[PDB]
Design a protein around this ligand. Structure first.
Ligand SMILES: CC(C)(COP(=O)(O)OP(=O)(O)OC[C@H]1O[C@@H](n2cnc3c(N)ncnc32)[C@H](O)[C@@H]1OP(=O)(O)O)[C@@H](O)C(=O)NCCC(=O)NCCS
Lengths: 715, 6, 179
């Protein structure tokens, strides 16, 4: 740090250029802050002229919260020679800052003449509109006249952007007049417009050509064809007589066509069944409708048995399973029978440890033959998250070949995994995904604009937005900080403390949730059931705790945030205790208080940092995963006590560090592993099929011992 | 003594 | 059942299709690049009830016409297990042959795992032929003897000629396929 400073002064002396001064001011900011903000404002008042210099100054003002915009605006006006390179710099620099709001302002300068850049400007008015109802009309009108300025349009992307500012009745008139062949995007929009405008004579004509002459075979299009037909007067027969082929789409359409003409459904429903009971889709298709009494009234085909049992909503299915327990067909496919076995298991789950363990044996047993059945694997992870068997979930996860975006949607299955260095490394590697995807989406937004792909740009933008500050991203950072400090290693600790200090605005906001709680339920009805034990608020609090530990100037702001959150927390008894302990410990060490306040907070820490008090962390059901989850949080707390006693040494801290020495031996005398082994050893299973219970019992016992002991050795 | 930065 | 254009946010909801063991999960880079450069060749099948993704086709165009190698390539097709055996993957691959942009090319390319029984059955009925065996295509270790074949990691490059060899025994290595 300080050698960088001397180096910067050397440079500034030699210059006695702009980019060096900015760098020095930034160092002075790091070291300090008001001094630096003054220096930067001084630098802004001077006419920034270099690209890199102007880029660095804009990032400085974004850090310190409107002066970043006004750096580029000045440079654009005072040297219009380079206005495009300045604008493109500003553009790339704004995408990386997740600053999507400023886009219109950049595109306006950059337009005041390239046609692509007019498209950018227009498109940006749509993007603004997707946020302030008072200026809606002006934005819409502005982008509309931009696109009319570009007619005739040359491609379907231009036409798309125009439609972004058109009413449904304008959209239909525009697209009915297009000479260019429409893409799928616009065909769907054309049909949408005609349906919304009740232009049914047009709709029916358009769909007929698509469905019949083009043989498009689109079910959404089929539904518009029979709707347009009835409205323009055609009868059941004239439409039905055109429906010959027995495709899946036409068969279901006959149901929809009966509904629309209020005819009776039974014949069309039975015809579909007899033609599609041999296919796994059968139940999902007919479950859409109100199926008649009589049809439920009604083998050599497993899939038929599957469907039929699902129609009657049969909860016990182990009979079918032993008929078809043997995996047959292609290796990489799944055994359809396990659609029903999984149904029976989920209906039997009752959250008691014996039932969890029993259904683990069953799931493990079914996966012996159905090696690649992802739903069984997800449910198996879910049951393991109910216990202290914390080192058994990562193998299932990696066996699914979860990679890239899947981490964002599925890493929560790893909520209960143990703090091993092997897992730390896995977590760091998941973070690598976030780092790389961050860069790739930024470059994909740039290139999407450089090509003319407005069709997909909003998706790119929203994709980026949804990854910038997700609960899955923050949970990854919380985990890395937790496991890093629990072990002795610090290879990445400093990096992530820097992430917290750099992103405090994100850390204290509302995180986006893209997690997948839906996939294990595919082809089942989502009842209430066992859940992976997530705690999103604790994730925030943890990141606040570390943010406060390493706050070097003023911890009061982050602590108000902390206290506002805990005050509304909805925690269990021990979690409530735990964040009060964190509150008192952080304020003693990280805020100026008078000798009386300090003694008060110390005495609360003193009263409760005792095993007799912290014993409440132990759940009544010892086999519950709450045990190790609480233990882990207690271990992390203690490590933070020891780190703070080094960072902010005091006699008080010295007394707390001594107070926590006996925890390890004391909790070892609570015999938490033995008790769990005794409970397991005294469980009687009558499984619904022949399965070896003993190996799962032995695996679970060993996994519990290893995970509890590792936490107990960490106290 | 001179000093480092030199 | 209905086909809709692919948008990037669909990745967040593709797990039932992409957890399947023969379905790869690519970099954000990769999906987005396809959407940027061949946006009309990336499309999905949706369900009747909720618009649940049933499957998708992810395709590109590549190659030099002077070298007779200007073609459409299939980089990913897959159907949700619930919607298999009812024409869906065939519908996806044939709808690809229908697009004008594909019609402009000479043939359709694709790699398939040698062990993937159903994928080979699929392209056989569609009229695809094995053009060459790519050795270690799906494997981690990069190898130099093309004759050290391995059914678990090798690939069949399949072609189907469009309106505009005769061996499964041509062994080639991944880095000799350039275009
Ligand atoms: C899973 C998969 C079977 C889904 O395909 P699909 O959409 O159900 O294919 P269809 O049901 O339309 O049938 C396609 C053809 O393959 C054959 N076929 C499909 N599934 C079959 C099975 N389980 N057993 C035997 N033959 C099968 C059929 O014979 C059919 O032609 P035909 O019925 O006219 O003879 C497979 O094709 C697929 O898409 N897998 C995705 C991932 C993968 O394994 N490979 C990726 C593509 S390289």
């Amino acid at each position: 740090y300080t050698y960088a400073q001397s180096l910067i002064t050397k440079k500034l002396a030699k210059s006695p250029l702009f980019y060096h001064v900015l760098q020095n001011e930034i160092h002075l900011k790091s070291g300090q802050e008001l001094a630096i903000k003054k220096n930067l404002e001084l630098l802004n008042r001077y006419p920034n002229d270099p690209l890199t210099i102007e880029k660095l100054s804009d990032f400085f003002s974004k850090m310190e919260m409107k002066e970043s915009s006004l750096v580029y605006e000045n440079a654009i006006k005072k040297y219009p020679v380079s206005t495009e390179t300045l604008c493109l710099s500003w553009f790339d620099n704004s995408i990386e800052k997740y600053d999507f709001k400023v886009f219109n302002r950049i595109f306006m300068y950059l337009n005041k003449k390239s046609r692509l850049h007019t498209l950018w400007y227009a498109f940006s008015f749509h993007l603004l509109l997707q946020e302030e109802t008072d200026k809606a009309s002006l934005y819409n009108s502005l982008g509309k006249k931009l696109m009319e300025g570009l007619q005739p349009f040359e491609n379907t992307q231009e036409i798309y952007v125009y439609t972004l500012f058109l009413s449904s009745k304008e959209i239909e008139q525009v697209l009915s007049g297009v000479t260019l062949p429409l893409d799928l995007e616009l065909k769907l929009l054309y049909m949408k417009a005609m349906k919304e405008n009740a232009s049914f004579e047009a709709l029916h004509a358009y769909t007929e050509k698509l469905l019949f002459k083009e043989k498009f075979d689109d079910f959404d299009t089929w539904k518009l064809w029979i709707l347009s037909g009835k409205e323009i007067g055609k009868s059941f027969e004239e439409l039905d007589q055109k429906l010959t082929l027995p495709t899946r789409n036409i068969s279901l359409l006959k149901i929809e066509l009966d509904i629309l003409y209020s005819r009776n459904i039974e014949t069309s429903v039975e015809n579909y069944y007899q033609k599609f009971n041999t296919k796994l889709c059968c139940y999902a298709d007919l479950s859409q409708y109100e199926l008649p009494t009589s049809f439920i009234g009604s083998e050599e085909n497993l899939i038929t048995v599957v469907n039929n049992r699902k129609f009657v909503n049969q909860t016990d299915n182990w009979d079918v399973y032993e008929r078809f327990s043997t995996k047959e067909g292609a290796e990489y496919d799944s055994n359809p029978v396990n659609e029903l076995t999984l149904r029976t298991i989920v209906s039997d789950l009752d959250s008691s440890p014996q039932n969890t363990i029993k259904n683990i044996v069953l799931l493990k047993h079914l996966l012996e033959q159905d090696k690649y059945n992802y739903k069984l694997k997800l449910w198996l992870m879910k049951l393991y998250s109910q216990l202290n068997t914390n080192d058994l979930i990562f193998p299932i996860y990696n066996g699914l070949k979860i990679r890239m975006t899947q981490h964002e949607t599925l890493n929560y299955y790893l909520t209960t995994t143990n703090p091993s260095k092997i897992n730390l490394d896995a977590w760091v590697d998941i973070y690598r995904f976030y780092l790389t995807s961050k860069q790739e989406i930024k470059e994909s937004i740039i290139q999407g604009f450089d090509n003319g792909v407005f069709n997909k740009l909003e998706g790119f933008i929203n994709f980026s937005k949804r990854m910038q500050n997700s609960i899955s991203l923050n949970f990854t950072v919380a985990k890395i900080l937790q496991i890093s400090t629990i072990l002795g290693t610090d290879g990445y600790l400093n990096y992530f403390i820097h992430y917290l200090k750099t992103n405090e605005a994100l850390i204290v906001s509302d995180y986006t949730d893209n997690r997948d709680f839906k996939s294990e339920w595919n082809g089942l009805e989502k009842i209430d059931c066992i859940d992976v034990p997530v705690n999103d608020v604790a994730t925030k609090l943890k990141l606040l705790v570390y943010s406060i530990v390493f706050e070097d100037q003023d911890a009061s702001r982050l602590l108000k945030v902390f206290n506002k959150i805990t005050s509304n927390a909805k925690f269990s008894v021990f979690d409530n205790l735990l964040y009060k302990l964190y509150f008192n410990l952080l304020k003693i060490t990280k805020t100026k208080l008078n000798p009386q306040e300090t003694q008060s907070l110390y005495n609360y820490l003193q009263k409760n940092l005792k095993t007799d008090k912290l014993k409440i962390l132990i759940p009544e059901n010892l086999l519950s995963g709450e045990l190790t989850q609480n233990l882990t949080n207690l271990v992390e707390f203690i490590k933070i006590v020891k780190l703070l006693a080094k960072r902010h040494p005091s006699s008080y801290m010295n007394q707390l560090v001594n107070l926590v020495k006996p925890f390890g031996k004391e909790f070892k005398n609570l015999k938490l592993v033995q008790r769990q082994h005794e409970i397991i050893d005294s469980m009687d299973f009558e499984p619904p099929i022949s399965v070896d219970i003993s190996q799962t019992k032995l695996e679970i016992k060993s996994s519990i011992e290893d995970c509890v002991v590792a936490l107990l050795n960490s106290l | 003594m001179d000093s480092e930065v030199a | 059942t209905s086909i809709k254009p692919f948008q990037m946010e669909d990745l967040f909801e593709l797990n039932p299709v992409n957890l399947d063991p023969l379905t790869e999960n690519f970099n954000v880079s990769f999906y987005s690049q396809y959407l940027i450069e061949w946006p009309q060749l990336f499309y999905k099948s949706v369900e009747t009830p909720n618009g649940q993704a049933s499957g998708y086709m992810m395709a590109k165009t590549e190659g030099q016409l002077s070298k007779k190698e200007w073609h459409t390539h299939i980089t990913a097709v897959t159907v949700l297990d619930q919607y298999r055996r009812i024409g869906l993957a065939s519908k996806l691959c044939l709808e690809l042959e229908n697009l004008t942009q594909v019609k402009d090319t000479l043939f359709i390319d694709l790699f398939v795992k040698v062990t993937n029984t159903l994928g080979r059955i699929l392209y056989e009925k569609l009229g695809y032929s094995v053009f060459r065996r790519v050795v270690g295509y799906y494997g981690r270790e990069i190898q130099k003897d093309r004759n050290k074949i391995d059914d678990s990691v090798d690939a069949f490059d399949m072609r189907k000629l469009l309106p505009r060899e005769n061996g499964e025994k041509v062994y080639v290595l991944p880095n000799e396929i350039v275009f």
